[PDB]
């Protein structure tokens, strides 16, 4: 499996960013399990399977699921992700 990295910027919607994060409760890191096709993440091009590498220019690949989620919720109206994406698929 070869992957490529990409940077993403997502404005918060009124129900959030619009995706379900999933992964290590306590590297490799959390990952995007599904994304609201009408939500803000889909609009910025987050896709299922995207694996979270950086949150607001901070390496977050080795964190707990809740520290990542909490900081995502605390990011305010905008968030930035760097992610790793399967390339062959």
């Amino acid at each position: 499996a070869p992957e490529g990295k990409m940077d993403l910027i997502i404005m918060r919607g009124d129900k959030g960013f619009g995706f379900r994060l999933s992964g290590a409760t306590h590297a490799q890191g959390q990952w995007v399990r599904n994304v609201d096709p009408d939500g803000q993440a889909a609009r910025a091009g987050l896709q299922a399977g995207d694996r979270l590498l950086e949150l607001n220019g901070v390496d977050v690949s080795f964190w707990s699921h809740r520290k990542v989620v909490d900081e995502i919720k605390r990011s305010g109206d905008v968030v930035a992700f760097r992610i790793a994406r399967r390339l062959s698929p």
């Binding site: 995706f19 379900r20 994060l21 999933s22 290590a24 399990r33 699921h65 809740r66 989620v69």
Partner: peptide, 7 residues
């Protein structure tokens, strides 16, 4: 799952 959350 291992740990899931909507954001």
């Amino acid at each position: 799952p291992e740990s899931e959350s909507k954001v």
